[PDB]
Amino acid sequence: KGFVPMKAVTYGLSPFQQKIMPGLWKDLPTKIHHKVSENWISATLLLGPLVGVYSYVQNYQEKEKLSHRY
Amino acid sequence: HEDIVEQVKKLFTKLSTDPTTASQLVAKEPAIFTGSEVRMLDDEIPLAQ
């Protein structure tokens, strides 16, 4: 149910020997470039068909509004 | 006691003469405790220690 026989060596430090907070604002320019050069075909597939449909509706409704005016 | 002292006074005559004690060597490199762990997993051994 939960047993896999194994062989490894692990080392570990204490919580009160390390710096807890400063590893968040570490290299935020490098962190941002990694996320957007790897997830730019998943947002071109999420926002793409929505920006292109909203452009069609606003153009359709601006040509039947100027055709009813006398 | 008085017979051993006169033997060592004429047998131990040639050992070195540096004036460094042990306390000057413990104090310039002290020992510091750290909380940490080591775990060695094997699972083919029958008992754990």
Reduced to 3 states, what is the DSSP secondary structure of residue A36? helix
Tally of residues, chain B: 49
Reduced to 3 states, what is the DSSP secondary structure of residue A55? helix
Q: Report DSSP letters for A4-27, one per residue.
A: ----EEEEEE-GGGS-SSTTSSSS
A26 to A17, A29, A57, B1, B18: CA distances (angstroms): 19, 9, 45, 71, 52
Chain B neighbors of A9, CB-CB under 8 A? 38-41
**Is any Cβ of chain A less than 8 angstroms from the Cβ of B23?**
no
Residue with tokens 């004036």: B19
| Interatomic CA distance for residues A30 and A5, integer angstroms | 39
User: A12 Cβ partners below 8 Å, 6+ apart?
Assistant: B36, B37, B39
Determination approach: cryo-EM
Give the DSSP H/E element, type plus range, for residue A28.
Answer: helix A28-36
Of A9, A12, A14, the CB nearest to B40: A9
State whether A14 and B36 contact (CB < 8 Å): yes
Residue with tokens 């597939």: A45
Over B7-27, what HEC string results?
HHHHHCCCCCCCCCCCHHHHC
Sign for the CA dihedral angle at A21, A27, A29, A32 comes to negative
User: A9 Cβ partners below 8 Å, 6+ apart?
Assistant: B38, B39, B40, B41
